[PDB]
Design a protein around this ligand. Structure first.
Ligand code: PLP
Ligand code: PLP
Ligand code: PLP
Ligand code: PLP
Ligand code: GUA
Ligand code: GUA
Ligand code: GUA
Ligand code: GUA
Lengths: 458, 459, 459, 458
């Protein structure tokens, strides 16, 4: 007999111990330790009762990489990127990723080491782009003797929340262009009507989270050029290309959306979205060194590489840099093209199967990113007992997360549902999703009474 | 017999018999085409060999070792995006539980079950959130008083970590710096108060100053600030930058009054990936109460009955560091944290005392309160020495160590110092290897007949 | 809920919160008592961190990389004792097949299916077996002729590897050395013959001289020895020390007559753990035929139809390397070996040519025939330089490399040279990293206003 | 259809390929490559049809280490010990192992860094000990003006073959002292009768491979002291403690066999036997630096450690050094004592169960190493139709290797069987062995006719 079996000794079975008869700590650190096996199960077992990542169809963020990328990143778990003097090869590798991304966006910058910065995601990358735009504008107005205490920026109502965070945490006024059925993306004329002497930039979006579409950056550039020539306000573009920045160079190389455009001075992207790297990666590039203010930034030479030192974060995992460089070499341009081709084709397939179903109609006929949205046909929705919120709940019962939500301003009456196709979501998994949707439709159509969300829409 | 595509990357290719491994890695542009995973894996991996090994990086404060079970747990969470809280509500609750545990480690008087605080990637984000909040609370007060609010400043030691300079740059807030001297090796509150005025948004004492390893005396600052605030009505608060010290003091110095026990400490930040014992990617910031976190910055969403504050500079991010932090709280508990930090501090104190015995060296402080310390050359020894600590740094790097030498901040910029940080996973046996290499390096440098370049640069 | 024995090593102990990790590792005496495996694992593992990583060790000729399948196969054989041939007869046969394959790579004319040869731990044991065999054949021939046989000698370049000095010392056999000059950068046959007499047991040309990377011309020696032997009747044979070149020449230089194609080459040795591409612990020695391996040294036992020679200095030993060798033969074949060695030699030639373009350097040879080469400072640059190749070695060590600087053997002792060995797993990309580090080290060393200790020691 | 499926492409199944219809190469390197999976199987599959290491009861060499030792050694597979400038911490660790072994043997040497050498096994360690003994004798005889060209050494007929290799490869005369049932180990007086002015050393054995016994080193030391004072020949002892060198210090600390004895000037041992490390480890220690000739050796200071550079091998795996240092720290003295206690207890147990069986009688009543030998009772053997060779074959049918062999000279008529108990052979496995032996006896006792080996004994 083992006296200390239940107390956590060498013979203890995790699930015959006192600790596994006790709740996990909510408020205070436990007074004492447990065995690693007990602690591992206590933390791990709490993650079972939620969405499995590969079935999370709400997220744009990578939920699969191959075995070699995963191994490489796991092996780098203890590498702090910011220790660049200690790890100068990763600092150089970061600079090469930035060069590769800037050249993917057709940067005209002649310096070997392109002007850009590592980020944890598009959040930090967007804020860096916006702060730079803010500082360039402050300096311009100061030289002109104009006031500089009431800046604004212009964006679609389809903005992702980081631009609201940017507005709040820096106290810069956000001016929003509404969406309508006639203008499903940023309309340049309406955007221009909100520009004045205090606008620091206009922010078109490539891969709008709410809709899956792309704002027309070239059309914005065109309108902005004539306006800037009229007023001298010199208003630039920052492209929020969180998803599209790793779609368009491979699948739409001739679409002029990037540094080929005169007024596109900076671009940001989520490397952890369609850059195909696990969470923790964004990039922001400037068209040239002259668009990155000295007040924000400096550069350090590491092994002959000029590495720009700008960022909101400091210490951070380096794994995602290795992961990014791995994807660039392992796939190359052709490999990225074929992976994004697969993701886009599966999205268009699901899009076309959704359109064949009696309850549904797609927001757009054109799928330009590996995602799309649909809603209930208005005449179907009128007499239906259910809403898309009910469909989301039905699908979650099979482990899927397929989100239903209302669109931004002037389309707030439209409840839509979104599917994001990422690498690792196959045609076979699409068929399973489509079968579950068909079954959910059949069950919901048996309702004799309206659901609560159906009643709330009345 | 012969395999036609052996060199081009087929199923029979040997990585190092291939054309790709006769070619340089891409510097400017994505390669046109793919390679095999094995080739690409080696191309990226092999570039990380020629640099400091993490366990021998003694410059860094950030965790380079966790146990096998924490490591496995975090690797298994590599594809989990924290910010997908609706999809992963159990991790959102776990995040709120870590914040509670941290706030209570800091003796928060907040009565709400779900404490006011936020996840961060490191003390960089956590400090900026603390500073933006102090700035917004100050703007609101001055606006309500009819006073100007366009020229904010904050007060901090010259021993600040660079994120406070970034904060000053990226928000255009004036940083006022209190210099270090040998008479005042940490932030002196009276000199701190001399830089306070109606435009001061907060004072930032530091627990675990990166340059020196010391702690600013937060309680002494709180006392001076209390009298000053009673005199002026400016209501200047404290944000404690406890990047390292926030996970040392609760366990090793429970009676040092530095945290939410003090009247004017309204927020505190810490690096979970330093002495919180989690691999890179974790910080925490807590507020003394919900009233100190402006609604302009923040909201909260209920996930499975837990009120989780949605404030942050980042959005999508790895969730593994939350599982790792919660694992350490459960696996070690208070006693286990105390015993690990005791080990790290004892080893730092051991090296500190061994350093003091060697003829060329003298310690900046006799008090080791965090698992790190700094030393410099005895002035009388340095005058006739042919070498500097930069030469010692280079000697040690030849054996794989990174032991950094650098000049101290303002009014001590003449002092070249060297720093050793003891982290979990750096043992007494490894300290003996370091000390042996230091002794051997000293004996080699003492044979020099001519001064080194850095020695001449000091002349 | 405190754990009383947490620091003493129970089921809850954290390695780096334990008393054991506050104590030094044992230097003199076995510790009195046990620890947990996790603690002991770290204590041993952590001592290996502070040294050169194998893939950046450019001094070594010995394999530092094999693919994942070879590595898995060898790890799985860690508990297999080769010498237990009755218990493990398939490995004994596998060893015999490896010996057959090596003998045929060297164009053995031996008609027996099972070639006469022996497993070794490296070229050290393989060379000693070859030399003892030559010594015994010589003793027997001199005895039958009624001549003395008590003062044997052998002839070799001053570029010998240290095993031949051990052979000379441990068997008390006189080693006669032919010096190197710039005019005779490898073994000159005429000078070698002038050191032969009636007591010379063999001449040892070297394929892959460690000091230089060059090949002694075996065919020229064989030709010279043939005429010498016809004149004197001394009947002196060749043993080829082909430690590196024995797995280079068959694939990249098939037409160079250096092996058993030559009349007087009676035995050849090689390091299987060098360019045979197997992890440490493998060498081979083959004889031209059974009549050249004395029965006094040897016997043969039949295992499963395989005639296995039982010759060796070692007895019990790891079997993993046999599996590793046979795997490489099957996995790569002739073509795969050819392409791997081609990559290594091409990268060595690439580094060789880039070094020649740098102002301080000049290469020892314009011919690169093994995946390694040496260079030194241009005499005119060296006169006024403040630094030596020893200073460059130390600088490159600061980035984790080991690139050795050393003086050449006799009559070239004045030459300080530096050597790079390119092994499987050293790519073009890693070469670019090395060359970049060299360029940077030169620019730093060129800033010196005073000479270094080694530069002064050169007077 | 996949055109290249059988030829080795990415879709090839190893056992649907042409290569797995072809024999493995016997004579010549294949002209071309295969896939790693095919090559892995081809080599691996050849190792199945032989004794499994844990059931190999012939071997004295370690067949089990724990998971941490095993992982530690695997991780060092690419580490060449001899690169001591590159790997100076392993050179220091090697020196610490030599110190620990030297003190385990009660070395009186005052130096911190004990005089000793790493080996691949007892073979190299014994040859180093014998070469040193040989060189010291040459120097002594030369200084006296005496001849030194006809060396000999004295050893039991129970020598292990390396001493024959030493005799052959160095051309030194081996003088053998026979075993008898009256003198089951080396008799000192018989040993002394073969010594003269040309004897370089006497070699007692601790853990004789043939018998499991220990030569009485202390009795040899006493007799050698009186002989040396009479003749002045100054003949020393080298102890071949291949097995016993890691048994006696823990289980028989009071037995005086090591450097405590005046004439024991060197001792060798197999670290890969009862030192508990996987194949590839030996040690030799000298009583002091004056007993290791400089002609054989030099010393290099690595990080303050004086490391002796003597050895027959050069480049070699360093993994075994880590494994040895791991075992010293992981087990300590107590842990070694308890592990060797277990192995010895199990051997004593099997020994006692063998003695109870009608056909058998043990060679010795005292088990002093974890091994022993037995033979057939003389009267049982006379009428039995089977021999121990037949028992060996029967046990091989169940996967065991339990060897039968004739003892060396003057016991050449004795066919014996040996069992070696190593770490990893438990009481439970001993019961399994004993059950198979019992079953085998019942089968062989049914023979109506004698076996080939039984007739060969007639
Ligand atoms: C992803 C997203 C963001 C926020 O990016 P993160 O990578 O989550 O930090 C901003 N804008 C758009 C269009 C996005 O899709
Ligand atoms: C670590 C550090 C910081 C920055 O924190 P990160 O975790 O690197 O983001 C700020 N202040 C101090 C005192 C620090 O030690
Ligand atoms: C490698 C080497 C040796 C010694 O061989 P090991 O494999 O280290 O035992 C002998 N001669 C030459 C030319 C060598 O390169
Ligand atoms: C093991 C053995 C040897 C040979 O030792 P290895 O470790 O196989 O090289 C020599 N003598 C005895 C008594 C042995 O048991
Ligand atoms: O992809 C995600 O998980 C979040 C980023 C986009 C969004 O806000 O929905
Ligand atoms: O610990 C690190 O690796 C960086 C922390 C902040 C600093 O030291 O400036
Ligand atoms: O390659 C090695 O690691 C040793 C080889 C022999 C030598 O260089 O002397
Ligand atoms: O134990 C072995 O595997 C061989 C050891 C030497 C022997 O007993 O012959």
């Amino acid at each position: 007999e083992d006296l200390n079996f239940r107390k956590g000794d060498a013979k203890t079975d995790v699930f015959g111990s006192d600790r596994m008869l006790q709740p996990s700590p909510v408020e205070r650190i436990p007074d004492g330790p447990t065995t690693p096996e007990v602690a591992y199960q206590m933390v791990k077992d709490e993650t079972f009762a939620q969405t499995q990542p590969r079935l999370n169809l709400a997220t744009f963020v990578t939920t699969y990489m191959d075995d070699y990328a995963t191994k490489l990143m796991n092996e780098a778990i203890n590498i702090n990127y910011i220790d660049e003097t200690e790890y100068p090869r990763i600092a150089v590798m970061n600079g090469k990723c930035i060069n590769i991304v800037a050249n993917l966006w057709n940067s005209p910058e002649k310096d070997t080491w392109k002007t850009g910065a590592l980020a944890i995601g598009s959040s930090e990358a967007c804020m860096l782009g916006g702060v730079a735009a803010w500082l360039r504008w402050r300096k311009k107005r100061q030289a002109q003797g104009k006031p500089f205490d009431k800046p604004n920026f212009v964006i679609s109502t389809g903005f992702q929340v980081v631009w609201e965070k940017f507005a709040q945490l820096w106290q810069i006024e956000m001016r929003e262009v509404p969406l309508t059925l006639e203008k499903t993306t940023l309309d340049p004329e309406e955007a221009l009507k909100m520009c004045d002497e205090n606008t620091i930039c206009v922010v078109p979006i490539q891969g709008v989270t709410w809709t899956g579409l792309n704002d027309d950056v070239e059309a914005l550039d065109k309108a902005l050029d004539a306006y800037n020539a009229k007023t001298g306000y010199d208003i630039p573009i920052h492209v929020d290309a969180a998803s599209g920045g790793f779609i368009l160079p491979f699948l739409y190389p001739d679409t002029k959306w990037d540094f080929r455009l005169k007024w596109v001075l900076s671009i940001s992207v989520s490397g952890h979205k369609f850059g195909l790297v696990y969470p923790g990666l964004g990039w922001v590039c400037w068209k040239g060194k002259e668009y990155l203010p000295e007040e924000m930034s400096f550069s350090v030479n590491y092994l002959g590489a000029n590495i720009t030192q700008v960022g909101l974060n400091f210490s951070r995992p380096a794994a995602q840099i290795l992961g990014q460089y791995y994807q660039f070499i392992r796939l190359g341009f052709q490999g990225y093209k074929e992976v994004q081709y697969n993701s886009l084709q599966i999205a268009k397939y699901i899009h076309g199967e959704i359109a064949k179903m009696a309850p549904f109609v797609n927001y757009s006929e054109n799928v330009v990113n590996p995602l799309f949205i649909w809603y209930l046909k208005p005449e179907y929705a009128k007499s239906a007992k259910w809403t898309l919120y009910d469909l989301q709940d039905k699908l979650s019962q099979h482990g899927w997360m397929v989100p239903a939500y209302t669109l931004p301003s002037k389309l707030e009456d439209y409840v839509v549902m979104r599917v994001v196709v990422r690498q690792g979501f196959s045609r076979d998994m699409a068929d399973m999703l489509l079968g579950d949707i068909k079954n959910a439709i059949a069950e919901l159509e048996k309702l004799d009474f309206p659901t609560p969300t159906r009643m709330a829409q009345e």
